[PDB]
Design a protein around this motif. Structure first.
Motif, PDB file in Angstrom:
ATOM      1  N   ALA A   1       0.569  -1.413   0.025  1.00  0.00           N
ATOM      2  CA  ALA A   1      -0.350  -0.093   0.178  1.00  0.00           C
ATOM      3  C   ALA A   1       0.871   1.282   0.007  1.00  0.00           C
ATOM      4  N   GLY A   2       1.669   1.234   1.204  1.00  0.00           N
ATOM      5  CA  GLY A   2       2.784   2.775   1.143  1.00  0.00           C
ATOM      6  C   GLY A   2       1.744   3.893   1.211  1.00  0.00           C
ATOM      7  N   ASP A   3       1.784   4.847   0.684  1.00  0.00           N
ATOM      8  CA  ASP A   3       1.627   5.587   0.774  1.00  0.00           C
ATOM      9  C   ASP A   3      -0.422   5.868   0.193  1.00  0.00           C
ATOM     10  N   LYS A   4      -0.775   5.227  -0.258  1.00  0.00           N
ATOM     11  CA  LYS A   4      -1.832   5.035  -0.508  1.00  0.00           C
ATOM     12  C   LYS A   4      -2.981   4.624   0.348  1.00  0.00           C
ATOM     13  N   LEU A   5      -1.964   4.386   1.974  1.00  0.00           N
ATOM     14  CA  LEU A   5      -2.860   3.839   3.360  1.00  0.00           C
ATOM     15  C   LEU A   5      -3.109   5.683   3.668  1.00  0.00           C
TER      16      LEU A   5
ATOM     17  N   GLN B   1     -10.500  -9.249  15.427  1.00  0.00           N
ATOM     18  CA  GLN B   1     -12.177  -8.411  15.314  1.00  0.00           C
ATOM     19  C   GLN B   1     -11.573  -7.270  14.972  1.00  0.00           C
ATOM     20  N   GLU B   2     -10.362  -6.206  16.291  1.00  0.00           N
ATOM     21  CA  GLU B   2     -10.098  -5.467  16.107  1.00  0.00           C
ATOM     22  C   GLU B   2      -9.063  -4.942  14.845  1.00  0.00           C
ATOM     23  N   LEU B   3      -8.758  -5.854  14.083  1.00  0.00           N
ATOM     24  CA  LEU B   3      -8.376  -5.282  13.098  1.00  0.00           C
ATOM     25  C   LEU B   3      -8.490  -6.207  11.749  1.00  0.00           C
ATOM     26  N   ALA B   4      -9.793  -6.903  11.671  1.00  0.00           N
ATOM     27  CA  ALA B   4     -10.913  -6.341  10.592  1.00  0.00           C
ATOM     28  C   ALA B   4     -11.607  -5.159  10.438  1.00  0.00           C
ATOM     29  N   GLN B   5     -11.850  -4.807  12.182  1.00  0.00           N
ATOM     30  CA  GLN B   5     -12.891  -2.994  12.035  1.00  0.00           C
ATOM     31  C   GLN B   5     -11.737  -2.259  11.738  1.00  0.00           C
ATOM     32  N   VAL B   6     -11.209  -1.696  11.935  1.00  0.00           N
ATOM     33  CA  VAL B   6      -9.644  -0.335  11.211  1.00  0.00           C
ATOM     34  C   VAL B   6      -9.119  -1.191   9.733  1.00  0.00           C
ATOM     35  N   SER B   7      -9.212  -1.575   9.594  1.00  0.00           N
ATOM     36  CA  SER B   7      -8.307  -2.595   8.713  1.00  0.00           C
ATOM     37  C   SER B   7      -9.255  -2.129   7.002  1.00  0.00           C
ATOM     38  N   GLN B   8     -10.645  -1.441   7.169  1.00  0.00           N
ATOM     39  CA  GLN B   8     -11.377  -1.372   5.648  1.00  0.00           C
ATOM     40  C   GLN B   8     -10.734  -1.169   4.461  1.00  0.00           C
ATOM     41  N   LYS B   9      -9.760   0.195   4.747  1.00  0.00           N
ATOM     42  CA  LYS B   9      -9.376   0.970   3.746  1.00  0.00           C
ATOM     43  C   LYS B   9      -8.283  -0.090   3.208  1.00  0.00           C
ATOM     44  N   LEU B  10      -7.376   0.127   3.828  1.00  0.00           N
ATOM     45  CA  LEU B  10      -6.548  -1.192   3.602  1.00  0.00           C
ATOM     46  C   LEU B  10      -6.967  -2.545   2.783  1.00  0.00           C
TER      47      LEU B  10
END
Lengths: 7, 219, 219, 219, 219, 7, 7, 7
Positions: free
Chosen positions: E165-169, E201-210
């Motif tokens: 992802a780099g700077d896309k994130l 679960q935490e990771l799934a919740q915070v990773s959507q944009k990734l």
């Protein structure tokens, strides 16, 4: 994880 | 107790390759609740079909269909990344609640299956019977589906690694790799385990330089 | 059905030699009713004790006692002649009705055992476990009890045949036969299978003339 | 050990009523030796046929016949008195030795069955399969044969007791008893368990005075 | 046949998470040959240890160790890409040949295990016994190891996707994602299934944009 | 028939 | 004892 | 595929 196909 | 209520047959869902994945094992005393976290088969998959099965057979089609339902609203992701948690809960009344919940979105869908649904006593005995009568064939089908599922994983992982590699990958390597990927994709369309394993083997033999570039990119 | 109520353990009664005789086999789906016709152990026996057992062990003492009751008023008869029919009926509520009925007198006595009686789930698993852990020892005990029960039958039948023979039986035969009967009665007091079989063997060797007289008396 | 040689099927003999009596239980590790003492079915029986069976079915005919042989020279005796000891010995080579030995006369006859005899792997699986597929029917046949065998015992014991009773037995009793004995003998010719049990019941109801005389004769 | 040589216990290898993966199922008649294609646990892994196990327990440590050996010379690759094919071949003499072969390099290493190796008859029965006595605990351990193995897959896949992802994130996404990745890595160190599932679960919740960027990169 | 002991 | 029929 | 740890 095991995968589930779409509808 | 002089009696226990127990599941006469395993309970589960259809998963990729047309196999039954058991969530509740035959002869489990109820109430009981089990869950397992599944993910998606395809890149950018928006929904999963949850096909609830009763039976002892490896092939989903060979089991009893208790019903099914979809969970949609899955956000765009690579295959295998979404977390779809599937829970089978059988309560004291013998009613099965199946749910599928997306841990990203929190969205959940359920099916409720009455205690009286599924196979009658005759059919149960027919099923226990067929599962022993076909134990060997079912074992072979498990090995096939497991092989096709691995080869699909290699197919897809390798294609991603080619893209990420770009010009790091020599032309001759890319020629050999893509021709092997095409042939593996074709083999994955059939049910000839030997064929799939032979294409996988070809890909392992031609991909060394690619493995090294991919290992380095994340080293 | 998603569930069946089934018996987690075999159900039966204590019979001669301290063994469990199963009337309802483990993993039978209920409602179910089974019966078997038993008889008396002793000449002129007036009553039978019906000791209801839950478990998988060969020895009655190793099983769970669900309770017991007597049926009396059995009319004077040789051992093994009365017909005492014992029925285990488990109804839809999972309640066990046990009855013992004398087919001569029509007299009947019952015990009713609540669905919640017997071994809890822990103890059930402890029991399935012990029965496999002791399968060999239980098999040996079955062979012993079967041998003692046969030798008791030979003991008693032979004594009756001596009496019926009277003077038809030569003195030397009667001397050899009674000394062997005494020794068999003693061996039957222990739990040494070899010992019992050796006295039975002695009796077969010395009884030929007696067998011939008995065969002739009813020919 | 990475391997055990075990019996894939139970081994035994045909006994009265056409049932298989197991001497060596399925999945027994060999070498192993088991024996059981049998007796004769008929008064004055001179020989016993030893029909060796492999299989899991209750009916002898439903099992595999491994062969058979006779032991003769049995001396005149009442049914159930001779001691015919039957031993199954499987040695380290997997060869089955079956013997039948008369404990009165010491006479012995044997059959030897090669390790390769019996059912092939296909047929073994067909057999395990049928035995589960027919578990209920086999259980019913066991109850029938057990009932007919009991009724035969009552038939014969009662006839002996009538003879021994002589004039001690009132005329009206003898009339009722013999008519019930005739009807029981007829019922024993069929395979209707209810019918047999109904004649046995009749005999118990009409025999009370006879039981009392027989009990007294040996008291 | 009066006898079959069969495996008394399942046979397999230790795989990631300390579990036994069965290649030859209990009560398989020999000769038999089974193989399965495994891969590596770590990026750039040069060798795999092949720990051969006999037993019915889910935990590798709870089984009998038949021995072990390494296959090295694995060429640099991302975890899960190498194809290490593992074959268990039991021949007519009951000797087990285990091999591990790298389908890229063709390199192969073997261990040969004598028919007499492994657990004796006592220990076999102790093992069948413990596996039933611990069926529930083993099932829980399977669910734990399966959960940790999934979370490890999410851990690693997500880290690769961040790098790609780099700077896309967006910064806020990367902050949330890395803190969740750190916490998941920690949870994966323990044996608390709930803990692991909560970090996943935490990771799934915070990773959507990734997920969306990764899906797009290979779309 | 199998036999049952007295009380 | 269990009984065996004649030949 | 199932994974095998290094030596």
């Amino acid at each position: 994880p095991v995968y589930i196909p779409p509808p | 107790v002089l009696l226990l209520d127990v599941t006469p047959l395993s309970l589960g869902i259809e998963t990729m390759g047309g196999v039954m994945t058991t969530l509740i094992a035959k002869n489990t005393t109820i109430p009981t609740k089990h869950s397992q976290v599944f993910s998606t088969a395809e890149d950018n998959q928006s929904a999963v079909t949850i096909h609830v099965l009763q039976g002892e057979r490896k092939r989903a089609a060979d089991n009893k269909s208790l019903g099914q339902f979809n969970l949609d609203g899955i956000n765009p992701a690579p295959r295998g990344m979404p977390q779809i948690e599937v829970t089978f809960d059988i309560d004291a009344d013998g009613i099965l609640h199946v749910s599928a919940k997306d841990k990203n979105s929190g969205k959940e869908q359920k099916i409720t299956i009455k205690a009286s649904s599924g196979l009658n006593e005759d059919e149960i005995q027919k099923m226990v019977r067929d599962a022993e009568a076909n134990a060997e064939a079912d074992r072979k089908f498990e090995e096939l589906v497991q092989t096709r599922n691995q080869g699909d994983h290699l197919l897809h992982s390798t294609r991603k690694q080619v893209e990420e590699a770009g010009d790091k990958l020599p032309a001759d390597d890319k020629t050999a790799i893509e021709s092997a990927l095409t042939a593996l994709e074709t083999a994955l369309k059939g049910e000839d385990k030997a064929a799939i394993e032979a294409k996988m083997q070809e890909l392992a033999q031609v991909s060394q330089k690619l493995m090294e570039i991919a290992q380095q990119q994340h080293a």
